[PDB]
Design an enzyme around this catalytic site. Structure first.
Site, PDB file in Angstrom:
ATOM      1  N   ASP A  23      -4.576  -3.024  -3.581  1.00 27.72           N
ATOM      2  CA  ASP A  23      -5.702  -2.895  -4.503  1.00 27.72           C
ATOM      3  C   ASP A  23      -5.728  -4.098  -5.442  1.00 27.72           C
ATOM      4  O   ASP A  23      -4.933  -5.020  -5.287  1.00 27.72           O
ATOM      5  CB  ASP A  23      -5.570  -1.616  -5.343  1.00 27.72           C
ATOM      6  CG  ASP A  23      -4.222  -1.511  -6.054  1.00 27.72           C
ATOM      7  OD1 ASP A  23      -3.611  -2.554  -6.366  1.00 27.72           O
ATOM      8  OD2 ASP A  23      -3.776  -0.375  -6.319  1.00 27.72           O
ATOM      9  N   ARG A  36       2.360 -12.354  -7.877  1.00 21.20           N
ATOM     10  CA  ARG A  36       3.668 -12.837  -7.440  1.00 21.20           C
ATOM     11  C   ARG A  36       3.526 -13.689  -6.177  1.00 21.20           C
ATOM     12  O   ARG A  36       4.518 -14.173  -5.634  1.00 21.20           O
ATOM     13  CB  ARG A  36       4.625 -11.673  -7.158  1.00 21.20           C
ATOM     14  CG  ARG A  36       4.917 -10.782  -8.351  1.00 21.20           C
ATOM     15  CD  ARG A  36       6.292 -10.138  -8.226  1.00 21.20           C
ATOM     16  NE  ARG A  36       6.446  -9.322  -7.021  1.00 21.20           N
ATOM     17  CZ  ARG A  36       5.901  -8.121  -6.847  1.00 21.20           C
ATOM     18  NH1 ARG A  36       5.156  -7.578  -7.802  1.00 21.20           N
ATOM     19  NH2 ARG A  36       6.113  -7.453  -5.719  1.00 21.20           N
ATOM     20  N   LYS A  75      21.921  13.767   7.631  1.00 16.43           N
ATOM     21  CA  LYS A  75      20.698  13.581   8.391  1.00 16.43           C
ATOM     22  C   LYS A  75      20.782  12.375   9.325  1.00 16.43           C
ATOM     23  O   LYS A  75      20.314  12.438  10.458  1.00 16.43           O
ATOM     24  CB  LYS A  75      19.506  13.457   7.441  1.00 16.43           C
ATOM     25  CG  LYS A  75      19.162  14.786   6.755  1.00 16.43           C
ATOM     26  CD  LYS A  75      17.925  14.684   5.888  1.00 16.43           C
ATOM     27  CE  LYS A  75      17.381  16.071   5.547  1.00 16.43           C
ATOM     28  NZ  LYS A  75      18.373  16.892   4.807  1.00 16.43           N
ATOM     29  N   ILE A  80      -7.275  13.712  -4.105  1.00 19.15           N
ATOM     30  CA  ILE A  80      -6.681  14.939  -3.593  1.00 19.15           C
ATOM     31  C   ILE A  80      -5.160  14.830  -3.661  1.00 19.15           C
ATOM     32  O   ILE A  80      -4.541  14.077  -2.899  1.00 19.15           O
ATOM     33  CB  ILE A  80      -7.089  15.209  -2.121  1.00 19.15           C
ATOM     34  CG1 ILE A  80      -8.605  15.422  -2.021  1.00 19.15           C
ATOM     35  CG2 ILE A  80      -6.348  16.452  -1.593  1.00 19.15           C
ATOM     36  CD1 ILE A  80      -9.077  15.861  -0.617  1.00 19.15           C
ATOM     37  N   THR A  97      -3.774  14.857   1.343  1.00 20.60           N
ATOM     38  CA  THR A  97      -3.432  14.049   0.161  1.00 20.60           C
ATOM     39  C   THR A  97      -3.700  12.559   0.363  1.00 20.60           C
ATOM     40  O   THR A  97      -3.610  11.773  -0.577  1.00 20.60           O
ATOM     41  CB  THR A  97      -1.950  14.204  -0.259  1.00 20.60           C
ATOM     42  OG1 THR A  97      -1.099  13.763   0.806  1.00 20.60           O
ATOM     43  CG2 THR A  97      -1.644  15.658  -0.620  1.00 20.60           C
ATOM     44  N   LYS A 157      26.213   6.042   3.478  1.00 23.90           N
ATOM     45  CA  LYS A 157      26.525   6.600   2.168  1.00 23.90           C
ATOM     46  C   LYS A 157      27.083   5.587   1.173  1.00 23.90           C
ATOM     47  O   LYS A 157      26.921   5.748  -0.038  1.00 23.90           O
ATOM     48  CB  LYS A 157      27.480   7.790   2.308  1.00 23.90           C
ATOM     49  CG  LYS A 157      27.578   8.622   1.030  1.00 23.90           C
ATOM     50  CD  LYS A 157      28.391   9.885   1.221  1.00 23.90           C
ATOM     51  CE  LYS A 157      28.565  10.618  -0.107  1.00 23.90           C
ATOM     52  NZ  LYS A 157      29.461  11.806   0.017  1.00 23.90           N
ATOM     53  N   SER A 198       1.476  -7.473  -7.102  1.00 17.73           N
ATOM     54  CA  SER A 198       2.146  -8.358  -6.155  1.00 17.73           C
ATOM     55  C   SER A 198       1.335  -9.625  -5.908  1.00 17.73           C
ATOM     56  O   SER A 198       1.903 -10.683  -5.647  1.00 17.73           O
ATOM     57  CB  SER A 198       2.383  -7.634  -4.828  1.00 17.73           C
ATOM     58  OG  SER A 198       1.158  -7.341  -4.178  1.00 17.73           O
ATOM     59  N   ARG A 229      -5.304  -2.716   3.928  1.00 20.86           N
ATOM     60  CA  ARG A 229      -4.741  -3.641   2.963  1.00 20.86           C
ATOM     61  C   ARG A 229      -5.730  -4.775   2.727  1.00 20.86           C
ATOM     62  O   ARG A 229      -6.665  -4.973   3.499  1.00 20.86           O
ATOM     63  CB  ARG A 229      -3.393  -4.177   3.449  1.00 20.86           C
ATOM     64  CG  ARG A 229      -2.305  -3.111   3.463  1.00 20.86           C
ATOM     65  CD  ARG A 229      -0.923  -3.721   3.597  1.00 20.86           C
ATOM     66  NE  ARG A 229      -0.620  -4.653   2.513  1.00 20.86           N
ATOM     67  CZ  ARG A 229      -0.374  -4.303   1.253  1.00 20.86           C
ATOM     68  NH1 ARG A 229      -0.387  -3.028   0.889  1.00 20.86           N
ATOM     69  NH2 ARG A 229      -0.111  -5.241   0.351  1.00 20.86           N
ATOM     70  N   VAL A 282      -6.422  11.451   0.911  1.00 23.92           N
ATOM     71  CA  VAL A 282      -7.730  11.239   0.300  1.00 23.92           C
ATOM     72  C   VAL A 282      -7.493  11.006  -1.196  1.00 23.92           C
ATOM     73  O   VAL A 282      -6.851  11.816  -1.852  1.00 23.92           O
ATOM     74  CB  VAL A 282      -8.649  12.480   0.443  1.00 23.92           C
ATOM     75  CG1 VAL A 282      -9.997  12.205  -0.243  1.00 23.92           C
ATOM     76  CG2 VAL A 282      -8.859  12.832   1.928  1.00 23.92           C
TER      77      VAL A 282
END
Ligand code: NA
Ligand code: NA
Length: 327
Positions: free
Chosen positions: A184, A177, A66, A100, A95, A54, A174, A143, A97
């Site tokens: 992508d 960088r 948690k 979607i 999701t 925390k 990136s 990737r 996909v």
DNA sequence: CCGACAACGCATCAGC
DNA sequence: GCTGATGCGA
DNA sequence: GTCGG
């Protein structure tokens, strides 16, 4: 630090993040968990209690609770439950996909469409984007090694120059960088003939040439300023063909190009700092421009920028190589 | 307590 | 048909 | 879920 340190905790937080995003449709909680996971991922110590966690920015009462349950039991009851939940796990899965999102995933699952097989059997219920996302499901989750990004950059710069040698194109993200891999390819494009006060075909001409030499293979969306599609490196005769990759190309006004290249190079953390610093000096910096802030808080006309350095100087800052813009 | 958490281009939907 | 909203992106 | 006015 090695994932081994608090990997159990961060994996847990990331899984919760995805469920919030894809099933609960709570984008802000999605980001809260991701922020918590990131700050914990950077912590160079094996967390002993939620209280310890925390103290980090982004970790509150709930996540500390948690973490205590996870350390004491090795799991989280709510997560174990949602995992077995066929509806939730299916919605979360769909999701993945491209095209979607949470809404489409929920609808599909509501009508018995839960797997790639089900999607594959219901082409009529998928829009153009989704069909492409389905077709390249596996490739899109792979990737891109830097070496391939270089080969990809080679083609993009060559073809763009081949269309018109006055075009200026920069591969950002990136990759710029210096990253070792990318998810992508993001290309920022401009042309001296195009300014904030300026032809509805500058982008089209480029996309067209890239298709002509068969680099761009599919289109997800395309307008006058932004293209989002698919591309693939050429294969050597009798060699495993490269997977298809996601590529976005943005056409930006010349007088906003560099602010754009700066923004889209990142990182997101560095952007926040440079912008936090920009305010100090009294300058407003967005992805398009950098403007002066009057004493009354009123931003004046945008400042002329002809290089990434100009921006740095405006706010008195030594130009930092993209390679050192980790933050 | 309770609003912010980025903004917007494009594809497509929902309403008129 | 047009206009504004929504989904998606990531 | 977390932060902060
Ligand atoms: Na905290
Ligand atoms: Na998706």
């Amino acid at each position: 630090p090695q994932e081994t340190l608090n990997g159990g905790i961060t994996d847990m937080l990331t899984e919760l993040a995805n469920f919030e995003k894809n099933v609960s449709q709570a984008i802000h909680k999605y980001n809260a968990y991701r922020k918590a996971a990131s700050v914990i991922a950077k912590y160079p110590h094996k967390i002993k209690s939620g209280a310890e966690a925390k103290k980090l920015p982004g970790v509150g009462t709930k996540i500390a609770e948690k973490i205590d349950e996870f350390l004491a039991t090795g799991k989280l009851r709510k997560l174990e439950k949602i995992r077995q939940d066929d509806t939730s796990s299916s919605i979360n899965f769909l999701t993945r996909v491209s095209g979607i999102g949470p809404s489409a995933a929920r609808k599909f699952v509501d009508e018995g469409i839960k797997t790639l097989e089900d999607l594959r059997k219901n082409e009529d219920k998928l829009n153009h984007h989704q069909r492409i996302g389905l077709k390249y499901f596996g490739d899109f989750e792979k990737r891109i090694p830097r070496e391939e990004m270089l080969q990809m950059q080679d083609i993009v710069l060559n073809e763009v120059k081949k269309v018109d040698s006055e075009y200026i194109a920069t591969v950002c993200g990136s990759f710029r960088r210096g990253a070792e891999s990318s998810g992508d390819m993001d290309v920022l494009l401009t042309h001296p003939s195009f300014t904030s006060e300026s032809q509805p075909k500058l982008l089209h001409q480029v996309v067209e040439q890239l298709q002509k030499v068969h680099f761009i293979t599919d289109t997800l969306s395309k307008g006058e300023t932004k293209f989002m599609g698919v591309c693939q490196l050429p294969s050597k005769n009798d060699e495993k063909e490269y997977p298809h990759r996601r590529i976005d190309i943005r056409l930006i006004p010349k007088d906003q190009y560099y602010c754009g290249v700066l923004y889209f190079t990142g990182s997101d953390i560095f952007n926040k700092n440079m912008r936090a610093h920009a305010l100090e000096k009294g300058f407003t910096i967005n992805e398009y421009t950098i403007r002066p802030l009057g004493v009354t808080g009123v931003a004046g006309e945008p400042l002329p920028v002809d290089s990434e350095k100009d921006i740095f100087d405006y706010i008195q800052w030594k130009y930092r190589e993209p390679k050192d813009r980790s933050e």
